[PDB]
Design an enzyme around this catalytic site. Structure first.
Site, short mmCIF file in Angstrom:
data_model
loop_
_atom_site.label_atom_id
_atom_site.label_comp_id
_atom_site.label_asym_id
_atom_site.label_seq_id
_atom_site.Cartn_x
_atom_site.Cartn_y
_atom_site.Cartn_z
N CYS B 109 0.37 -1.30 -0.09
CA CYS B 109 -0.30 -0.36 0.35
C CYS B 109 0.20 0.94 -0.18
O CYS B 109 1.33 1.67 0.98
CB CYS B 109 -0.58 -0.15 1.23
SG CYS B 109 -1.99 1.82 1.63
N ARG B 112 0.22 5.07 2.93
CA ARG B 112 -0.10 4.98 4.00
C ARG B 112 0.93 5.72 4.50
O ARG B 112 0.80 6.14 5.84
CB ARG B 112 1.41 4.33 4.81
CG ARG B 112 1.10 2.24 3.86
CD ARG B 112 1.65 1.35 4.83
NE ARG B 112 2.83 0.93 3.76
CZ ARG B 112 3.78 0.61 3.91
NH1 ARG B 112 4.38 -0.21 5.04
NH2 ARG B 112 4.48 0.08 2.63
N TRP B 281 -9.05 6.59 -0.67
CA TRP B 281 -9.71 6.56 -1.95
C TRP B 281 -8.66 6.25 -2.61
O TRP B 281 -7.93 6.08 -3.17
CB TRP B 281 -9.72 8.18 -1.98
CG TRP B 281 -8.25 8.54 -1.69
CD1 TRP B 281 -6.74 9.20 -2.50
CD2 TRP B 281 -8.34 9.19 -0.25
NE1 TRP B 281 -6.55 9.66 -1.07
CE2 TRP B 281 -7.04 10.27 0.09
CE3 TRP B 281 -8.69 9.52 1.21
CZ2 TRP B 281 -6.07 10.45 0.97
CZ3 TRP B 281 -8.56 9.88 1.53
CH2 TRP B 281 -7.37 10.70 1.85
N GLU B 286 -5.29 2.69 -10.92
CA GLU B 286 -5.85 1.57 -10.18
C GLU B 286 -6.68 1.59 -11.06
O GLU B 286 -6.85 -0.14 -11.96
CB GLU B 286 -6.37 1.63 -8.83
CG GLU B 286 -5.28 1.53 -8.05
CD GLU B 286 -5.86 1.63 -6.64
OE1 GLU B 286 -6.44 0.91 -6.13
OE2 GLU B 286 -5.83 2.46 -5.75
C1 HEM Z 1 -6.31 7.06 1.45
C2 HEM Z 1 -6.42 6.30 0.87
C3 HEM Z 1 -5.53 5.10 0.13
C4 HEM Z 1 -4.69 4.85 -1.28
C5 HEM Z 1 -4.23 5.98 -1.93
C6 HEM Z 1 -4.50 4.07 -1.40
C7 HEM Z 1 -3.58 2.81 -2.32
C8 HEM Z 1 -3.25 1.97 -2.25
C9 HEM Z 1 -2.75 1.37 -3.62
C10 HEM Z 1 -2.66 1.54 -5.45
C11 HEM Z 1 -2.70 -0.40 -3.49
C12 HEM Z 1 -2.88 -1.43 -4.47
C13 HEM Z 1 -3.59 -1.39 -4.46
C14 HEM Z 1 -4.41 -2.78 -5.96
O1 HEM Z 1 -3.21 -2.21 -6.77
O2 HEM Z 1 -4.91 -3.66 -6.23
C15 HEM Z 1 -3.11 -0.59 -2.13
C16 HEM Z 1 -3.09 -1.59 -1.60
C17 HEM Z 1 -3.26 -1.87 -0.55
N1 HEM Z 1 -3.73 -1.14 0.92
FE1 HEM Z 1 -4.01 0.95 0.44
N2 HEM Z 1 -4.58 3.03 -0.22
C18 HEM Z 1 -5.16 3.71 0.73
C19 HEM Z 1 -6.24 3.34 1.86
C20 HEM Z 1 -6.02 2.17 2.58
C21 HEM Z 1 -6.58 2.02 3.69
C22 HEM Z 1 -7.20 3.15 4.53
C23 HEM Z 1 -6.12 0.97 3.90
C24 HEM Z 1 -7.03 -0.09 5.10
C25 HEM Z 1 -7.39 0.41 6.28
C26 HEM Z 1 -5.31 0.47 2.94
C27 HEM Z 1 -4.85 -1.20 2.98
C28 HEM Z 1 -4.14 -1.48 2.13
C29 HEM Z 1 -3.82 -3.31 2.11
C30 HEM Z 1 -4.21 -4.32 2.91
C31 HEM Z 1 -3.21 -3.46 0.06
C32 HEM Z 1 -3.07 -4.91 -0.32
C33 HEM Z 1 -3.48 -4.66 -1.20
C34 HEM Z 1 -4.28 -6.20 -1.77
O3 HEM Z 1 -3.48 -7.20 -1.37
O4 HEM Z 1 -5.29 -6.36 -2.48
N3 HEM Z 1 -5.00 1.00 2.19
N4 HEM Z 1 -3.53 0.61 -1.23
N1 LIG Z 2 -7.30 3.03 -2.97
C1 LIG Z 2 -6.79 1.36 -2.61
N2 LIG Z 2 -7.22 1.91 -0.91
N3 LIG Z 2 -7.67 0.22 -3.60
C2 LIG Z 2 -7.77 -1.06 -2.69
C3 LIG Z 2 -7.68 -1.73 -3.96
C4 LIG Z 2 -8.48 -1.37 -4.69
C5 LIG Z 2 -8.29 -2.24 -6.82
N4 LIG Z 2 -7.06 -2.12 -6.43
C6 LIG Z 2 -9.34 -1.90 -7.52
O1 LIG Z 2 -8.86 -0.76 -8.52
O2 LIG Z 2 -10.97 -1.56 -7.35
#
Ligand code: HEM
Ligand SMILES: NC(=[NH2+])NCCC[C@H](N)C(=O)O
Ligand code: HEM
Ligand SMILES: C[C@]12CCCC(=O)C1=Nc1c(nc(N)[nH]c1=O)N2
Ligand SMILES: C[C@]12CCCC(=O)C1=Nc1c(nc(N)[nH]c1=O)N2
Ligand SMILES: NC(=[NH2+])NCCC[C@H](N)C(=O)O
Ligand SMILES: [Zn+2]
EC number: 1.14.13.39
Lengths: 405, 405
Positions: B109, B112, B281, B286
């Site tokens: 992620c 963070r 968000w 993505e």
């Molecule tokens: C604040 C807005 C956020 C943005 C812009 C963001 C951005 C991202 C992006 C681009 C990925 C890769 C996703 C993919 O390609 O499927 C990701 C993965 C992840 N995010 Fe964040 N994220 C955000 C908020 C959060 C929040 C609030 C949580 C948990 C409370 C979180 C937990 C994770 C986890 C667990 C993954 C692993 C995805 C997976 O294994 O499918 N994200 N995030």
């Molecule tokens: N911005 C995030 N935290 N996304 C969680 C993964 C969402 C996923 N990559 C999608 O296109 O639906």
């Protein structure tokens, strides 16, 4: 399931198992506790014998002769020679085989579909820095072939018991100079700053353009290096232009046709070849994205974006992306016009997928470094991005080595 | 020993010392690196005790209270609870801290920097699918906040000894249907084909569109899943236009504001939360790169390139790279025109750099998965591309878990 790595391709939904990794003698940087796969460089006795024995077996295997008499005779001859001289020599075609193999084994090289077509110039007779110059010139002549490029490698004498290495100081046979200023900045290619300063220190007369081809600094056993200037007609270069943006031509950007890594140690059956430059042809993105847009190289993205009239005050206009596409386009177009071999990151990766499948059949795996195989633009737009990969060290191998100085 | 981690753009080195904290193993061994595999090959009282002690010491440390009266009596509580029931329960403020720390620890992620701003809804008092649906509905309502998006998680009851898990069958709370056509191909999001079928198979009548919002399939312990249709008005959607190309809009492309992952498991102090959907968000790529341009997704490159008037016939024209760029541009324009929060890939990776920096000072490192943090386009054009990253598992943690059916 089988206990070997389950490798999946997420686009096609297909599975393979990599059984090849079982052959890896050497360990890399990962441990169960932490993965270090993203780092560029991760932090002789009876030893030689078993490295040597394994290589001979690869060889005799490759010519389909395992167990044969030539084979066990060859094994005996090798260990007689380590027995008395603490070392051993390779037959001609053993060298050719091992060179190709090292390439085929290289986890960071996307061009490996071509691995079986490599011209190997034996130069294990080389006795002077003068002589090294002649061979290198010859290599460049052959490899360049007036723009119709041929993959090749030249192999200088290997390392020996209490006798200094053969070394090419430059990181590539052809590199642009980098000059430091007081105004802090760097003129030329900032990657090459050190080798540039080093050439001047050893008595070169510097130029002062963005694109001055550096002289070779060539080192022979137990001697200081010697300086050598490439005859300019040997060094083929490609002036850069855009197919529709008339001004790009005016930036006066250029690149050289031949990528020739000259600083990597080539290890075969435990013998170590410290001077063994290889060359191929470029993939569009090496010049177009890394060399010309890295923030620590030519860093031309901003210059070009301004010319394209993009809004560079804001990331959300994707100005960095738009400029990049157009630069890559110009690199490709200019080489195509100039009739110099190049490959775009699409064709390239499509061929690596074909390589992955050939190797699956032939060896049961293919060691590959994802962060390094995925191009630095348009990653997910290419098939390799969706392909999981296993990385491991196989030998023969191309290996990084400390700098002679 | 602790890894030297280098940034190649800035020449700065650091040492990751946090990774000594990691208790869970990853898929890599010194013999081969499995870093790029998406999922694990894989996928008690004395042990839960220790995971819990470690977590509680974590929580009190977090509030500057180690060895306080409160700390010791809380450990003794957990002691007593486990010793008796084979398990224990978390206080609300411990949960809250846990959820936050799980996002903080999530290697894949890039958001963070936001890790401290998380609204945490305690849903541990839920006995039916109906209630789950009402909780799911508030989460969406709150998270969406009429376009001004806000990060939330909603934690349902933890797993327990010998009874079914609370589970949300959907992989996100908002997904489009995928309908298989007789002629093999898929209408709508092809990654959702399975989840679509399960919904028709529990009584939902399907749409016939590319962009049908799926129902939710909610399961309480040891019952058949029940189906619930989200109210249309709680599901905010953006239609896709492009700033300059008028026809783009006509293409009918839409997407939804809320990325709310629902199939992952939240582990805190060895308790497992089998349904804890979270949302933040979107990062633009993505949607605009993966969901729209993946060849196994909506797969729209060629449609656009055709509309854009580009040479579709050869890879050298870079038509893909060109179309990809407009498509990301249009996602960003379109979200910003709807006053719906989105972050672009340049801005996001810039903020991820700051995060890495804050975490260096705060903890001695930052578990990070390079291949997941670099965007799908323009990789070397963002600063993360040039930043070495060490990947590893810290607890609390989101983990993947098997599909419930
Ligand atoms: C604040 C807005 C956020 C943005 C812009 C963001 C951005 C991202 C992006 C681009 C990925 C890769 C996703 C993919 O390609 O499927 C990701 C993965 C992840 N995010 Fe964040 N994220 C955000 C908020 C959060 C929040 C609030 C949580 C948990 C409370 C979180 C937990 C994770 C986890 C667990 C993954 C692993 C995805 C997976 O294994 O499918 N994200 N995030
Ligand atoms: N911005 C995030 N935290 N996304 C969680 C993964 C969402 C996923 N990559 C999608 O296109 O639906
Ligand atoms: C034939 C055309 C070829 C193409 C298109 C090709 C492509 C590439 C590319 C894109 C890289 C990574 C470059 C970088 O980003 O620094 C690479 C690395 C490498 N290639 Fe190939 N290659 C080709 C020929 C060869 C040949 C002939 C050899 C050796 C016999 C070779 C061995 C390697 C090695 C050892 C690396 C890693 C170097 C490092 O770690 O810096 N390549 N090649
Ligand atoms: C992004 C990464 C690995 C991480 C660090 C770095 O700067 C890299 N450099 C290169 C790379 N891949 C290639 N082909 N070439 C690089 O120089 N991958
Ligand atoms: C490319 C790779 C890792 C390798 C396998 C794969 O398909 C991936 N999938 C994703 C990825 N990164 C992100 N952010 N998301 C993915 O789905 N990286
Ligand atoms: N296609 C190749 N053989 N590349 C070798 C690496 C060359 C180096 N990346 C450069 O751009 O000069
Ligand atoms: Zn690894």
């Amino acid at each position: 399931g089988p206990k070997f790595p389950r490798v999946k391709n997420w686009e096609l939904g297909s599975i393979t198992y990599d059984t090849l990794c079982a052959q890896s003698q050497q360990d890399g940087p990962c441990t169960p506790r932490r993965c270090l796969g993203s780092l560029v460089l991760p932090r002789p006795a009876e030893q030689l014998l078993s490295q040597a024995r394994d290589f001979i077996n690869q060889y005799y295997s490759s010519i389909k002769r395992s167990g044969s008499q030539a084979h066990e005779e060859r094994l005996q001859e090798v260990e007689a020679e380590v027995a008395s001289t603490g070392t051993y020599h390779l037959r001609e075609s053993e060298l050719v085989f091992g060179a190709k193999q090292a390439w085929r084994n290289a986890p960071r090289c996307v061009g490996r579909i071509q691995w079986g077509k490599l011209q190997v110039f034996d130069a294990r007779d080389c006795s002077s820095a003068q002589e090294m110059f002649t061979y290198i010139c010859n290599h460049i002549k052959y490899a360049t072939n007036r723009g119709n490029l041929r993959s090749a490698i030249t192999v200088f004498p290997q390392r020996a018991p209490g006798r200094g290495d053969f070394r090419i100081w430059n990181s590539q046979l052809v590199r642009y100079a980098g000059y430091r200023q007081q105004d802090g900045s760097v003129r030329g290619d900032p990657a090459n700053v050190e080798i540039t300063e080093l050439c001047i220190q050893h008595g070169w007369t510097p130029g002062n353009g963005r694109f001055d081809v550096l002289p070779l600094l060539l080192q022979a056993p137990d001697e200081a290096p010697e300086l050598f200037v490439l005859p300019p007609e040997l060094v083929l270069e490609v002036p850069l232009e855009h197919p529709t943006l008339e001004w790009f031509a005016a930036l006066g950007l250029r690149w050289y046709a031949l990528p020739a890594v000259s600083n990597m140690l080539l290890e075969i059956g435990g013998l170590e070849f410290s001077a063994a430059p290889f060359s191929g042809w470029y993939m569009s993105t090496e010049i177009g994205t890394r060399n010309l847009c890295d923030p620590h190289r030519y860093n031309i993205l901003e210059d070009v974006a301004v010319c394209m009239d993009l809004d560079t005050r804001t990331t959300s206009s994707l100005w960095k992306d738009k400029a990049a596409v157009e630069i890559n386009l110009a690199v490709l177009h200019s080489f195509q016009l100039a009739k110099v071999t190049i490959v775009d990151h699409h064709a390239a990766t499509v061929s690596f997928m074909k390589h992955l499948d050939n190797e699956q059949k032939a060896r049961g795996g293919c060691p590959a470094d994802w962060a390094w195989i995925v191009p630095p633009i348009s990653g997910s737009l290419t098939p390799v991005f969706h392909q999981e990969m296993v990385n491991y060290i196989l030998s023969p191998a191309f290996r990084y080595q400390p700098d002679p100085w």
